[PDB]
Design an enzyme around this catalytic site. Structure first.
Site, mmCIF file in Angstrom:
data_model
loop_
_atom_site.group_PDB
_atom_site.id
_atom_site.type_symbol
_atom_site.label_atom_id
_atom_site.label_comp_id
_atom_site.label_asym_id
_atom_site.label_seq_id
_atom_site.Cartn_x
_atom_site.Cartn_y
_atom_site.Cartn_z
ATOM 1 N N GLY A 187 0.806 -1.210 0.000
ATOM 2 C CA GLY A 187 0.000 0.000 0.000
ATOM 3 C C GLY A 187 0.840 1.260 0.000
ATOM 4 C CG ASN B 147 9.886 -11.382 -6.437
ATOM 5 O OD1 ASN B 147 10.491 -11.504 -5.372
ATOM 6 N ND2 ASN B 147 9.742 -10.213 -7.048
ATOM 7 C CD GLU C 176 22.985 8.393 -26.044
ATOM 8 O OE1 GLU C 176 23.189 7.389 -26.758
ATOM 9 O OE2 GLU C 176 23.901 9.151 -25.659
ATOM 10 C CG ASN D 92 16.325 -7.280 -3.059
ATOM 11 O OD1 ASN D 92 15.454 -7.863 -3.705
ATOM 12 N ND2 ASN D 92 16.075 -6.674 -1.910
ATOM 13 C CB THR E 60 3.725 -11.417 -0.680
ATOM 14 O OG1 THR E 60 3.404 -10.069 -1.038
ATOM 15 C CG2 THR E 60 4.825 -11.931 -1.595
HETATM 16 N N1 LIG Z 1 12.023 -8.106 -5.414
HETATM 17 C C1 LIG Z 1 11.724 -7.663 -4.198
HETATM 18 N N2 LIG Z 1 10.411 -7.406 -3.861
HETATM 19 C C2 LIG Z 1 10.095 -6.952 -2.627
HETATM 20 C C3 LIG Z 1 11.089 -6.752 -1.683
HETATM 21 N N3 LIG Z 1 10.502 -6.307 -0.550
HETATM 22 C C4 LIG Z 1 9.169 -6.218 -0.756
HETATM 23 N N4 LIG Z 1 8.900 -6.623 -2.036
HETATM 24 C C5 LIG Z 1 7.573 -6.667 -2.673
HETATM 25 O O1 LIG Z 1 6.744 -5.673 -2.097
HETATM 26 C C6 LIG Z 1 5.435 -6.164 -1.904
HETATM 27 C C7 LIG Z 1 4.804 -5.548 -0.660
HETATM 28 O O2 LIG Z 1 5.216 -4.209 -0.490
HETATM 29 P P1 LIG Z 1 6.297 -3.838 0.643
HETATM 30 O O3 LIG Z 1 7.533 -3.235 0.019
HETATM 31 O O4 LIG Z 1 6.644 -5.082 1.425
HETATM 32 O O5 LIG Z 1 5.571 -2.785 1.625
HETATM 33 P P2 LIG Z 1 5.379 -1.235 1.232
HETATM 34 O O6 LIG Z 1 5.865 -0.955 -0.168
HETATM 35 O O7 LIG Z 1 6.105 -0.374 2.240
HETATM 36 O O8 LIG Z 1 3.795 -0.970 1.333
HETATM 37 P P3 LIG Z 1 2.987 -1.338 2.673
HETATM 38 O O9 LIG Z 1 2.795 -2.833 2.723
HETATM 39 O O10 LIG Z 1 1.642 -0.655 2.674
HETATM 40 O O11 LIG Z 1 3.783 -0.873 3.868
HETATM 41 C C8 LIG Z 1 5.572 -7.670 -1.774
HETATM 42 O O12 LIG Z 1 4.527 -8.322 -2.455
HETATM 43 C C9 LIG Z 1 6.900 -8.005 -2.418
HETATM 44 O O13 LIG Z 1 6.688 -8.686 -3.632
HETATM 45 C C10 LIG Z 1 12.415 -7.011 -2.011
HETATM 46 O O14 LIG Z 1 13.306 -6.840 -1.182
HETATM 47 N N5 LIG Z 1 12.728 -7.469 -3.273
#
Ligand SMILES: Nc1nc2c(ncn2[C@@H]2O[C@H](COP(=O)(O)OP(=O)(O)OP(=O)(O)O)[C@@H](O)[C@H]2O)c(=O)[nH]1
Ligand SMILES: Nc1nc2c(ncn2[C@@H]2O[C@H](COP(=O)(O)OP(=O)(O)OP(=O)(O)O)[C@@H](O)[C@H]2O)c(=O)[nH]1
Ligand SMILES: Nc1nc2c(ncn2[C@@H]2O[C@H](COP(=O)(O)OP(=O)(O)O)[C@@H](O)[C@H]2O)c(=O)[nH]1
Ligand SMILES: [Mg+2]
Ligand SMILES: [Mg+2]
EC number: 3.6.5.-
Lengths: 427, 434, 65, 432
Positions: free
Chosen positions: B139, B201, B249, B223, B174
């Site tokens: 979110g 992913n 470019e 990552n 997730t």
């Molecule tokens: N590839 C990758 N995806 C990630 C990583 N961390 C979170 N995600 C993705 O981010 C999604 C959820 O968002 P989050 O980054 O965990 O949380 P947020 O963006 O802070 O948003 P909120 O949940 O409302 O706090 C998950 O479904 C993951 O797929 C990461 O380190 N690498």
């Protein structure tokens, strides 16, 4: 006297110019510091044509280096001869063109075109009797292809009498490193034709073939391509810088390679092209120089002259030689390849001799000439251009610059009009 | 000189920034304290800025609406490397809610993040662009990033904004309310973005299992791979090369129309040391690896689409000679398809410095590498599946009560669904051949 | 998985078609920056003009008596 | 030579005199005994004795003994000569009347006699720095009286007025605004410049910038010390553009009834914050215009600047100064009147600021001080008039004041003058 101003645009054009200023500094016995370490006196008598006098026996080349990205300039200043160019001649923008012709030519080239205007005007008033201007760039770029053509538009109005010769780099269809390349090319060639006294179509793919097979280089870099253009660059002016038996200048060929002002497109050539090891074999004579320089594989443009008719041919030779073998040699190749020459201009061949050979090498010849096979190059662009234009593709980049749509149509009209009248002279 | 500012959002943004900035520190030689112990001289000027104390500060904006993930950095190895003002936290998260990230909690700190990025742009002289890293599922990373990019496009109309964001996966998930935020972020990423790098992913899971032999990897692995891709895309700005290619470019040579800015990324080789011990690698090797559908970073088959535009970044001991041989061989394949209106659709860049390897990584030390950005039409099927599942929830009016209580109007669900359907229609129109 | 390729780098001593031309062109090889062969020749230059020779024999030649 | 004599009044004045003179001893090298362990830059603050001692030229005054007695047993007990610290047996207890007509007159002659001897020691006196509070009765009632009786002794000597104005929201007293009105006749009639400051604004700046979630008055005391050090920094130590007290009075006061500028200081950062932020001339000159960095609760964006004064000090080059003011002129929300085309006055000093142990600001190489005259100060007095009429209508607390010995006509006159003061500021606010 007869001086030359060397313009320089784009990542491409800056790299050929650095290589070109390298060899003629090696030729004139100029060290990277800027002093003279040559031996003979003829090496220093006409240095004013390229090198401007300084205090302490020092010389500065009369070049104007331009690029909209400053990141090429740091590589220019850090090269072998990186300090021999004057810092005031480095003119640059903070933002590159991003391979957009319209961005470079109008939006960002307008601000910086006044600065390059000031230096070349200052350099023009430095020399006494300027012969003309030279420039090297790429038609597939955004700086040279874009704002670089705007330079050509301005200076013809300021200095119309002076001869302008562009050693432009024409992109290949088989090897392309730009998606929007046919666009920037199409709004470029229209700009050259209206004001350019002679053009030199350079194609990396053709140079690429030469290092593949003619020199058999396992891993050739970009520098050797720039070396061959630099060798070609030196071989056209060498009749001016040094005495010759039968002299010429840029005008003598610029008057002679164009029967009609719309026709100023030529492919360049260089005669001796063998291996470093093999020079001690290949018993070197004047007839073998002829054989290498009427071979389509020797040609550095992307066109095979067999499908075209050679309109005009001019060759400049070097080093001490007696002339009899030459004049019969293009006398020879004129009769036997009669179908490959036009009939309405008898004796299509111009000759000139410079008595000084290039450094280290013994005999060399430089081929510039007009032929119908250059029309093959432009029509391949149009088939790419109209296909990408039929769907208005890659256009919002050009449209967002404030330009309108008809500029694509009139440019598509012009080189279609060029190839039509070019085809009419073939038949 | 060129400058790229990072705007990483959410947990995904912060973790990706950790990996990417440790990679940048490693290649530039920056110690975690932030001092230089000893192509190009100011090669760190694109990412790091000098201070009075001889210390380099990254041009990064970490923003998260939950403080745990950023306190990990504040107490990690790189605590002194980062400006504690640059790290921005929220007390309460959006809790996987686009409405919370877009209308209630984001507005409390929108001014603060605007001021921080304003200062970060004021420090630089010539800003090349803005790299925005986030995810559509969370979110925070959906709503707050959408609002920030909305206000950013009107603050800086000219400055390019490139989008690296992590999509909901086609099979695994997730979250369960991830598709709602997925629909509602599509309008913002369609209107206020210049190019997108949608990543799922599952494809990276498959790549790491099948190639790097890691049967049980972790999130830092993906990552690290993303950081490697970003290092490859920024290599031409950071170091010198025969064909230096700026962001503008490939923006020009990847985007035909303002509504098409969704290419696909691809990095090769990805092999372990036990395999690179024996397999000889070349330009033909890496360019053939870059066209494998099982190697693609998204979960789609380009063989079911048409390649429209390709941007290649060769790096290391590469030679244009073999580059062109690779290009010709690629052109002489039937299975690889191109549209009728793009006969020449290659954009080549070349960089000198071969990629560096972090300790604890999996990629072997390789002399040559390549990154590919392919705008093609086979991506539309992912949004098609997203539309299927979103309608399959929306018809019975599920989960909308949370959003409505947060305070938005239910019409925007249908409007964004119509927007995505129209975008798929447009991609079909482009795929149409005459 | 595995990758297909065509050609390879090889080494210098090992037989490859065109090894011989590689090793004969080895003089002035450098593979980036600059060219490789530098000047196309490395032998002695010479500065005798045709008019200069045609004029100087009268000064110095077979001074027959 | 150059000399400054300080006449700090009130529990503010004793506490800010101690804090400011703590900084004065550290920058020059005075021991707490008064010894130099190792040219005459200290003469503006110190003076030689018959035992080779350096004695500050300050007169601490208060009407309650316990405030100054903490100084007399303090660390610097042997640095201050005991007569210069003046006390009183009973105080006004937050009433202007008692400190001006009953208890003040008991000590007028001895303080006036004391200031005579300190001025007798000086040869060429430059100005009188005066610090007090509008809230405390003794810092308002008595400090008003000496200003009238100092002006008759020296009609021409400058009288700068640093003061503590009450905060718009928080307050230490309820009867405070009465003292605020009837004192504003004094700071108008017998003063040459003003530096009003509310503790709430500094309370904001300290907690948000210096990360002290619970500051104390000492933290507020130190920051005012940095301001007064830099305004005098041209006199004490050499510089490219020395700026005397007479110098900045001229380029701050376009009209004599308008002598109420606003001070501003930058940067004010912690060492945790200073490590990661690069500090240049541009980065510190913009912070002097931020409304969040102001020590008065008023926004200049609601008004217009009449006159700005620049006090540059530290590693500062004339090149970046002209570039900094160039960018400042190129900002629209920064407004100016039509009749002030060029409103700057730059001074350059060389000695960088010093840090006190136990202080808050990290050691820095360069800084800026602002003295900007704007009309946004006017709305502060309007709120005070608003608060005054809500209690003068009910005639509350007045029975205290009349019983002390003054008439009821004066509150009406004092309220009227401030309205005329507010009216004149709009005339300048009008653009022709
Ligand atoms: N590839 C990758 N995806 C990630 C990583 N961390 C979170 N995600 C993705 O981010 C999604 C959820 O968002 P989050 O980054 O965990 O949380 P947020 O963006 O802070 O948003 P909120 O949940 O409302 O706090 C998950 O479904 C993951 O797929 C990461 O380190 N690498
Ligand atoms: N900023 C600051 N203000 C102070 C300080 N000491 C006292 N004050 C202010 O003084 C006001 C109260 O008046 P005091 O100075 O304590 O007492 P006074 O001036 O001697 O007057 P009386 O109480 O009548 O004796 C409070 O509202 C404080 O704001 C100080 O050290 N720093
Ligand atoms: N022959 C040759 N071509 C070059 C060289 N450098 C660049 N190019 C060509 O120039 C084209 C790109 O030009 P570009 O840098 O975009 O031009 P700009 O926009 O004016 O800077 C590519 O197609 C390259 O093939 C060089 O050193 N030699
Ligand atoms: Mg989250
Ligand atoms: Mg008191």
């Amino acid at each position: 006297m007869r001086e030359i101003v060397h313009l320089q645009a784009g990542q491409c054009g800056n790299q050929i110019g650095a290589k070109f200023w390298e060899v003629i500094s090696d030729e004139h016995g100029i060290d990277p510091t800027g002093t003279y370490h040559g031996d003979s006196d003829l090496q220093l008598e006409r240095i004013n044509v390229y090198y401007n006098e300084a205090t302490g026996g020092k010389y500065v080349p009369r070049a104007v280096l331009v690029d909209l990205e400053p990141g090429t300039m740091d590589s220019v200043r850090s090269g072998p001869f990186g300090q021999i160019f004057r810092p005031d001649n480095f003119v640059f923008g903070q933002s590159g063109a991003g391979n957009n012709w319209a961005k470079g030519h109008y939006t960002e080239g307008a601000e910086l075109v006044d600065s390059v205007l000031d230096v070349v005007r200052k350099e023009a008033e430095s020399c006494d009797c300027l012969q003309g201007f030279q420039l090297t760039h790429s038609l597939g770029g955004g700086t040279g292809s874009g704002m670089g053509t705007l330079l050509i538009s301005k200076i013809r109005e300021e200095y119309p009498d002076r001869i302008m010769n562009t050693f432009s780099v024409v992109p290949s269809p088989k090897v392309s490193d730009t998606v929007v390349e046919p666009y920037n090319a199409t709004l470029s060639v229209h700009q050259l034709v209206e004001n350019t006294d002679e053009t030199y179509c350079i194609d990396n793919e053709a140079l690429y073939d030469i290092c593949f097979r003619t020199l058999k280089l396992t891993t050739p870099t970009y520098g050797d391509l720039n070396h061959l253009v630099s060798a070609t660059m030196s071989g056209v002016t060498t009749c001016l810088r040094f005495p010759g038996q039968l002299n010429a200048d840029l005008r003598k060929l610029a008057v002679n390679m164009v029967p009609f002002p719309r026709l100023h497109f030529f492919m360049p050539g260089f005669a001796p092209l063998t291996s470093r090891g093999s020079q001690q074999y290949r018993a070197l004579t004047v007839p073998e120089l002829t054989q290498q320089m009427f071979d389509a594989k020797n040609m550095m443009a992307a066109c095979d002259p067999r499908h075209g008719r050679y309109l005009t041919v001019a060759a400049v030779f070097r080093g001490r030689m007696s002339m009899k073998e030459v004049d019969e040699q293009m006398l020879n190749v004129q009769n036997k390849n009669s179908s490959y020459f036009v009939e309405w201009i008898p004796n299509n061949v111009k000759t000139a001799v410079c008595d000084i050979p290039p450094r280290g090498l013994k005999m060399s010849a430089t081929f510039i000439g007009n032929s119908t096979a250059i029309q093959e190059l432009f029509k391949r662009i149009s088939e790419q251009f109209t296909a990408m234009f039929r769907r208005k593709a890659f256009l919002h980049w050009y449209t967002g610059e404030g330009m309108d749509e008809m500029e694509f149509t009139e440019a598509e009209s012009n080189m279609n009009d060029l190839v039509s009248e070019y085809q009419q002279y073939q038949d | 000189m060129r400058e790229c500012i990072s705007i990483h959002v959410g947990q995904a943004g912060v973790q990706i920034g950790n990996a990417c900035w440790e990679l940048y520190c490693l290649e530039h030689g920056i110690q975690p304290d932030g001092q230089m112990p000893s192509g190009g001289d100011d090669s760190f000027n694109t990412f790091f800025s000098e201070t009075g104390a001889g210390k380099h500060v990254p041009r990064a904006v970490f923003v998260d609406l939950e403080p745990t993930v950023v306190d990990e950095v504040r107490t990690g190895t790189y605590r002194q490397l980062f400006h504690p003002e640059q790290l921005i936290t929220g007390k309460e998260d959006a809790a996987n809610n686009y409405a919370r990230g877009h209308y209630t909690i984001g507005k409390e700190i929108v001014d603060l993040v605007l001021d921080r990025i304003r200062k970060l742009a004021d420090l630089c002289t010539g800003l090349q662009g803005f790299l925005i890293f986030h995810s559509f599922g969370g979110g925070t990373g959906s709503g707050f990033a959408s609002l920030l990019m909305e206000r950013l496009s009107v603050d800086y109309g000219k400055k390019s904004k490139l989008e690296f964001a992590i999509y909901p996966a086609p099979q695994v998930s997730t979250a369960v309310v991830e598709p709602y935020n997925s629909i509602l972020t599509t309008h913002t990423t369609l209107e206020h973005s210049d190019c997108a790098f949608m990543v799922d992913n599952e494809a990276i899971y498959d790549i790491c299992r099948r190639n790097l032999d890691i049967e049980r990897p972790t999130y830092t692995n993906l990552n690290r791979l993303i950081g490697q891709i970003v290092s490859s895309i920024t290599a031409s700005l950071r170091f010198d090369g025969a064909l230096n290619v700026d962001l503008t470019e490939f923006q020009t040579n990847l985007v035909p129309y303002p509504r098409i800015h969704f290419p696909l990324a691809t990095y090769a080789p990805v092999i372990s040391a036990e395999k690179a011990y024996h397999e000889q690698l070349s330009v033909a090797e890496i360019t053939n690896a870059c066209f494998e559908p099982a190697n693609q970073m998204v979960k789609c088959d380009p063989r079911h689409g048409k390649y429209m535009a390709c941007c290649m970044l060769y790096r290391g001991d590469v030679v244009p000679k073999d580059v062109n041989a690779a290009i010709a061989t690629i052109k002489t394949k039937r299975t690889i398809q191109f549209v009728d209106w793009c006969p020449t659709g290659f954009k080549v860049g070349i960089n000198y410095q071969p990629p560096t390897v972090v300790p604890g990584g999996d990629l072997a030390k390789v002399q040559r590498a390549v990154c590919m950005l392919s705008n093609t039409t086979a991506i539309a099927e992912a949004w098609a599946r997203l539309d299927h599942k979103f309608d399959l929830m929306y018809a019975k009016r599920a989960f909308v009560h949370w959003y409505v209580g947060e305070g938005m109007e239910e019409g925007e669900f249908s409007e964004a669904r119509e927007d995505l359907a129209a975008l798929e229609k447009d991609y079909e129109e482009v795929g149409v051949d005459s | 998985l595995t990758l297909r390729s065509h050609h390879k780098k090889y080494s210098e001593p090992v037989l490859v078609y065109s090894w011989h031309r590689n090793r004969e062109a080895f003089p002035k090889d450098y593979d980036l920056c600059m060219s490789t062969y530098k000047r196309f020749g490395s032998d002695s230059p010479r500065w005798m003009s045709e008019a200069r020779e045609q004029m100087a024999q009268v000064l110095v030649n077979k001074d027959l008596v």
